[PDB]
A = this chain, B = another copy of it.
Amino acid sequence: SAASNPSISHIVLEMPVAINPLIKYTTRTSVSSLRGAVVNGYIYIQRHLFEFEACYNNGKGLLNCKNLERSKYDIDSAELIGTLIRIPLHDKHSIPHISIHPDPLSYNGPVTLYLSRYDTELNKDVLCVHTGFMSEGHHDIKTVFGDCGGMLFDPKGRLLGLHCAGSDDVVFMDTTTGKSNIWTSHPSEIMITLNNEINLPNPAKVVYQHPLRNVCATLETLQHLTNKTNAKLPYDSRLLSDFNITAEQYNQYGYYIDYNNFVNNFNRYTTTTIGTKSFETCIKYGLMDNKKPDYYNQ
């Protein structure tokens, strides 16, 4: 129901499907493919389209790629930037330019994923949009390997980066201490920025500190579960090890928590819904209470 659908408002983007071309690397006996992203005069293609050095061959491997025409792209000027291959367009505005988020790995909140697909009903290549949530370069929009190169945007239409990789499951611990935490007892979807930033160690098993979460939404959720009257309660340092929430953030948002109550009821609280919202949904988007009239708020 509407009680549990975050119903995030995303600004509608108008972009040609050509901004996200399917690129195919072929040999006599095999094919590999993913999408490129044409951003502000350059196309960006991730390394695993192509063992790599021999196939990429210092850019020479680009000549064996379909939908990577020399008339469109300055192949000779292709640059290997870490996990990204960046190639200039001959006409830098043949694809319209787009807004870029100024600090994408610091973004936390709702996102969209845009992907080119061929629609068999409409009989044409079309851009497809998908909604979800991201926390510092990690998101929850389901992908397959070919979807590498899909484009991720914030709700204002600013580009965050490109879908890059994922995993069937992650392991959890307090990575700031190397100690197991409450979560040690969830697939990953990962983004790369146009400057080759990935929020993973040695990116050239995935370890998360906690499930995807928004700090304010988590505090709201935990307060609801453990302290319904929101009576003042001291900060618990396990908020730091279990949720990476600092004492400063705790005081800032004003949601007070009885954290022992959360620990002592951890299984029930993480397997039963709040209303009809899953715990994992609540800590991303908040409790989605029915909006009060604008004049009643202060």
Contact = CB atoms under 8 A, between A and B. Distances in A.
B291 A144 contact: yes
A205 to B, nearest CB: 15
The secondary-structure label for the interface of chain A is loop
A166 interface: yes
A3 B3 CA distance: 20
A32 interface: no
A11 B126 contact: yes
A106 to B, nearest CB: 17
Given A117-B9, A129-B12, A168-B290, A2 B271 contact: no
A122 interface: yes
- Oligomer copy total: 2
A128 interface: yes
A200 interface: no
Interface stretch (A35-43, A52-60, A65-73, A274-282): A274-282
B156 A121 contact: yes
Interface in A72-114: 113-114
A100 to B, nearest CB: 15
B8 A130 contact: yes
A232 interface: no
Nearest to A119: B11
Nearest to A186: B1
Interface string A264-298: 00000001110011111100000010110000000
Interface string A177-221: 000000000111100000000000000000000011000000000
Contact of A9 (B5, B115, B139, B280): B115
Contacts of A188: 1-2
Interface of A: 1-5, 7-15, 113-115, 117, 119, 121-122, 126-133, 139-144, 156, 166, 168, 186-189, 211-212, 271-273, 276-281, 288, 290-291
3 tightest A-B CB contacts, nearest first: A7-B142, A2-B142, A12-B127
